[PDB]
Design a protein around this nucleic acid. Structure first.
Ligand SMILES: *C(=O)[C@@H](N)Cc1ccccc1
Lengths: 427, 134
RNA sequence: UUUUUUUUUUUUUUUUUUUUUUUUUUUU
RNA sequence: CUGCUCAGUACGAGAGGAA
RNA sequence: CUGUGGUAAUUCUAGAG
RNA sequence: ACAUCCAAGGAAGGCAGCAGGCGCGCAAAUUACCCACUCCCGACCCGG
RNA sequence: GCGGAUUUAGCUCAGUUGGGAGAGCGCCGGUCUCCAAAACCGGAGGUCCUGUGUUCGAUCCACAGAAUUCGCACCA
RNA sequence: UGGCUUGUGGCGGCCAAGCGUUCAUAGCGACGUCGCUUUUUGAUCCUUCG
RNA sequence: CGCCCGUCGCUACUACCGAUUGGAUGGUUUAGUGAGGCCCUCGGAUCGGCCCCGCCGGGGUCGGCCCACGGCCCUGGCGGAGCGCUGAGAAGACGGUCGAACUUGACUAUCUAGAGGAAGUAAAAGUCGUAACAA
């Protein structure tokens, strides 16, 4: 049964965690006694409507504020697939976390509230339906399902006109991003009631498409590049009684087996795999797509962090002394010059990088040079630029390992530009 | 031949006059230094302060005050190589060791009984010559 | 028998940093 | 005066936060 | 040792041959 | 005196025995293979 | 991960409410000297840590980075 | 104690040059001028040493 | 124009002294309290054997043609079912020595906080006087 990684994305409060939680529940992955206890705890803290969300949101600050802060990973299994599902935050402060999530994903569920004002807000200039869609594209997610959520809400009440309104807006925007919009399901659901999650909803007779589970089965599994050299960007590092220090991350390329000797770049520390675990099931090998924790003998937690990359010793992950990229500028309030230093979000990493030169401005649609060494770039421009990371950074050429070779540029907490790396000068 | 005990007792007591023997005899070594008699202690560079040489010799000596791990006490330390300052950054883990038998510092040095040999769990020789690390 | 011998201070505190240079057979 | 629902709501770019 | 049993849970343990 | 899981009712534990985690520090390993050797333990074998 | 401080002249610090900085050492330079000390001249010396927003204009505000610090959270 | 009066204390008030980045009064007001007040203090000797 | 002394002013580091009846730590503990097992006076949930009586079935003898029957000895079943006596035997319980642990203080050994007071040492030179070395 093929495995897939699913990221759940969308604007703050639109219903991401409630969807995932409620889906896991009616699919029977969550103990009724636990759902009962969560509900009681939720009511007693003034937050009844967070009972499904609190399956995913566990941190003290998440519960206090009623928001997701960082990623949560859950395994569930449909008729055709086994999914690792990744719950991502909508809050603008934590889009860096959502991005690491997208970097690990094969497909995305975009959760979009149909409630009056909630939709418009998410799709507004500085909204996260807009931003998350953009970032998901740049991190290389092609398969997308959209859950038009909260159909149950009184200000919505299962209205097909409201639904078709959000669908059309979403379609015009998504097509401008390069999505193949004709192929993607727009399912009207209620993460809270359950409508169209797993079974079909009587409240919405006018809807003929897949339910969300059906839409999942209609996805297609991605290429498994087992013959390219091992690369595992670390998403987090735990220190675990019995195991020791265990990096977690999704195997992008190559294969990893217990016994293997592995190196973590850019620090250059080397350890040896004691064990491998996916969703609490011990493994002996892990292949691309596997989202795993791997115990490492001889490595201290302080040696390694998120955004580090693990490969085998003979073909270690490339550390960029500098690198070259083709970029498009989504948004900027003035202009970008040589010297401009946004943070680069690539795979699980995020490191400020200085533009040391702008070799050429390109026509954004054709790719031809329109000017050698432009005096600056502005919103709407495309370019070939050189980048020097402020601290050691791992990147690969897009042509070689695309999952370590696509990136976003962010500055003053906004997404400014997008990029693919066309060349790397190794450290 | 029957007066053996006096000579026996006399020797041990007169022996107390030897200060190094005395040093072993009193639990002082354990408590006279931040180490506890230890040869090496891991530490943190609290500050880097330039100091002046003593007597006719005139020089600026590289000096680091270090917070020790288990001990948690202030330490006066000597930076050894030429441009180690370029390579010494505040709050990087540092291993320190002493100079020529415990007691007095090198005559040129003022109040430092300790030497800095590791940066970030890396020996000094490696940073110092180009071929090794950077 | 051969020798003293007075005189005595009326008036002289202090002196910044650093100082320096050394090594041998064998006869043509 | 306080709590429960009002409600993490409207209003906010957020911080927040009602009646 | 047969069978017949109860409990969230423990080296729980009935009653009957 | 520590301190593990609590269906709220309860139930356990003594790794100063091998492995293995932490801690501590200036300072000491691997979650392996096996009864073939040396013995020993149970009854007339050959178990452990 | 979150949140606060701090970053200004070679050194250490003061200012500020957007029109654009100011002092104590330094010290450094010269004269005299073997070289300093003393003495006597002479020195001016800063992308106000960085990007972007706002603005006619950003050292200052807003929003974002770095580096150092200090709280707090997370806990294979 | 009480009492005249209110300098002193306390409080409002007309005018608006100024603060308040644009603007005087949203929120404050120089000076200058009208006063209310009798829990401060002051001056006065009227009632109380028969 | 040689050496040389001490107070006084900076800057730093040690150690001495110290209002708080000062704080922290670990060992032996006086007393008051006392879980828990255990020996021991009891108790007595409960179980079986024989005691007495009546009734039947079966083996061996005696009085009966019988057969039922009665007596002895041994078992099976029912009533007075426990009503008479005995044995082992859980909860509990008298009084104990052992003695955890709680508290209240002691006491050592081991560090330690502090306004101030007082030396020194880095000690090169600022500032006062000539003590010692040549009666
Ligand atoms: C260890 O649990 C990982 N394999 C799963 C995980 C848990 C928490 C945080 C990150 C990863």
């Amino acid at each position: 049964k093929p495995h897939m990684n699913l990221v759940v994305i969308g604007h703050v409060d639109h219903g991401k965690s409630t969807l995932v939680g409620h889906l896991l529940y009616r699919l029977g992955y969550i103990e009724e006694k636990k759902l009962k206890e969560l509900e009681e705890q939720a009511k007693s803290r003034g937050k009844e409507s967070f009972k499904f969300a609190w399956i995913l949101d566990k941190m003290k600050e998440e519960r206090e504020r009623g928001i997701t802060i960082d990623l949560t990973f859950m395994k569930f299994e449909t008729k055709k697939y086994v999914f690792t599902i990744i719950d991502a935050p909508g809050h603008r402060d934590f889009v860096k976390n959502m991005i690491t999530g997208a970097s690990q994903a094969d497909a995305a569920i975009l959760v979009v509230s149909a409630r009056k004002g909630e939709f418009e807000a998410g799709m507004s200039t500085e909204g996260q339906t807009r931003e998350h869609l953009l970032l998901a594209r740049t991190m290389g997610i092609e398969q997308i399902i959209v859950a038009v959520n909260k159909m149950d809400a009184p200000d919505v009440n299962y209205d097909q006109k409201r639904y078709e309104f959000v669908v059309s807006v979403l379609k015009k925007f998504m097509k401008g991003l390069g999505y193949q919009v004709d192929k993607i399901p727009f399912i009207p659901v209620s993460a809270w009631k359950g409508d169209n999650l797993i079974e079909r909803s009587p409240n919405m007779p006018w809807y003929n498409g897949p339910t969300l589970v059906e839409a999942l089965d209609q996805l297609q599994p991605p290429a498994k590049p087992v013959d390219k050299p091992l690369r595992i960007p670390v998403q987090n590092v735990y220190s675990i009684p019995g195991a020791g220090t265990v990096p977690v991350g999704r195997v992008e390329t190559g294969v990893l087996r217990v016994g293997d000797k592995v190196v973590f770049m850019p620090p250059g520390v080397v350890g040896e795999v004691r064990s491998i675990e996916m969703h609490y099931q011990q493994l002996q090998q892990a292949e691309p797509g596997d989202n795993i924790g791997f115990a490492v003998r001889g490595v201290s937690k302080s040696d390694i962090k998120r955004g580090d990359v693990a490969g085998h010793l003979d073909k270690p992950p490339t550390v960029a002394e500098e690198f070259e990229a083709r970029i498009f500028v989504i948004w900027h309030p003035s202009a970008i010059t040589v010297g401009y230093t946004p943070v680069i979000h690539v795979h699980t990493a995020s490191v400020s990088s200085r533009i040391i030169e702008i070799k050429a401005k390109l026509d954004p649609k054709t790719g031809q040079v329109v000017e050698q060494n432009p005096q600056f770039l502005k919103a709407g421009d495309a370019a070939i630029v050189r980048f020097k990371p402020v601290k050691p950074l791992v990147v690969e050429k897009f042509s070689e390992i695309p999952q370590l070779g696509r990136f976003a540029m962010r500055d003053m907490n906004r997404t400014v530009g997008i990029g693919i790396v066309t060349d790397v000068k190794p450290a | 031949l029957r007066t053996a005990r006096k000579l026996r007792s006399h020797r041990r007591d007169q022996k107390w006059h030897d200060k190094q023997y005395k040093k072993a005899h009193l639990g002082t070594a354990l408590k006279a230094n931040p180490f506890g008699g230890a040869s090496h202690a891991k530490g943190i560079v609290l500050e880097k302060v330039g100091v002046e040489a003593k007597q006719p010799n005139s020089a600026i000596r590289k000096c680091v005050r270090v917070q020790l791990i288990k001990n948690g006490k202030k330490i006066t330390a000597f930076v050894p190589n030429d441009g180690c300052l370029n390579f010494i950054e505040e709050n990087d883990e540092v291993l320190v060791a002493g100079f020529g038998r415990k007691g007095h510092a090198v005559g040129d040095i003022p109040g430092v009984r300790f030497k800095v040999v590791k940066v970030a769990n890396v020996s000094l020789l490696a940073l110092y010559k180009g071929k090794k690390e950077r």
